[PDB]
Design a protein around this ligand. Structure first.
Ligand code: YXD
Length: 263
């Protein structure tokens, strides 16, 4: 399999829309990631438009796109370190200094996206990739949308994301602000990094694990595996009411966020 001067050597991933392949240029040996999409045309039009805007060290770089009939090829920066998902040990997590470093980088990427009026809407460890120097890069803009245009905020109403990562207001409100939704998903990623376990299948009324958290039953898993300092931050992020939820400027003032750590 090939595209112009690129050979598609290895399947890096498969999902909701197509497949991601390792593309090696036959001449130069440059290795990039290629997203292959069958057909949706209005969806990829929006996606390419968002991808062309992205210019930040913690966000995946877009190189260009090629169309071969009904097949779209999206050329992007390769993340040679793979996914954050594969750095999380099930039921353990990872060393707290590594989690803190990845969390600072995630915040840097999210601040950038929010600053250009883009919401990711599917922040999770499978979408958080690592470069050669273990730097976090926010990937996959297939669900990404404009929430601010001409300095005017637009409320969202679409159901999207991944249930264990979604904010409770998506399930309970007709319309909601984009930024607290991405902040909430970052809090679930932090939980996964520190405990190697997700706290609930979804933050709904019927979910006992979610009710346990709202009742402050932190003697339960995954919370009992987390140190008091990052746990205090999680208590400010995983707040049911999005208007009461901590914002990224205040996360940057948090005690754990600013706590010196080393393995
Ligand atoms: C859904 N989506 C993904 C992307 C996306 C955009 C840019 C870049 C990547 C990417 O590098 N993906 C990747 C890489 C790797 N590895 C493992 C070995 C490999 C090597 C040879 C050691 O370098 C790097 C693993 N998984 C993935 C990923 F993400 F699951 F696909 N994916 C856009 N939508």
């Amino acid at each position: 399999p090939f595209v112009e001067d690129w050979d598609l050597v290895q399947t890096l991933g498969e999902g909701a829309y197509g497949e991601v392949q390792l593309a090696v240029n036959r001449v130069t040996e440059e290795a990039v990631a290629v997203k292959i999409v069958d057909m949706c045309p209005e969806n990829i039009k929006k996606e390419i438009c968002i991808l062309k805007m992205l210019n930040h060290e913690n966000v995946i770089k877009f190189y260009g796109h090629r169309r071969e009939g009904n097949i779209q090829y999206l050329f992007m920066e390769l993340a040679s370190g793979g996914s954050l998902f594969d750095r999380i040990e099930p039921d353990i997590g990872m060393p707290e200094p590594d989690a803190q470093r990845f969390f600072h980088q995630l915040m840097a990427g999210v601040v950038y996206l929010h600053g250009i009026g883009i919401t990711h809407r599917d922040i999770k460890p499978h979408n958080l990739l690592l470069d050669e120097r273990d730097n976090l890069k926010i990937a996959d803009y297939s669900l990404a949308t404009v929430f601010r245009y001409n300095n005017r905020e637009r409320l969202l109403n679409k159901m999207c994301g991944t249930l264990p990562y979604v904010a409770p207001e998506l399930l309970k409100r007709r319309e909601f602000h984009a930024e607290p939704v991405d902040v909430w998903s970052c809090g679930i990623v932090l939980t996964a990094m520190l405990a190697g376990e997700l706290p609930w299948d979804q933050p709904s009324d019927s979910c006992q694990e979610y009710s346990d958290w709202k009742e402050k039953k932190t003697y339960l898993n995954p919370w009992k595996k987390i140190d008091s300092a990052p746990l205090a931050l999680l208590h400010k992020i995983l707040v049911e009411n999005p208007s009461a939820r901590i914002t990224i400027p205040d996360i940057k003032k948090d005690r754990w966020y600013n706590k010196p750590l080393k393995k």
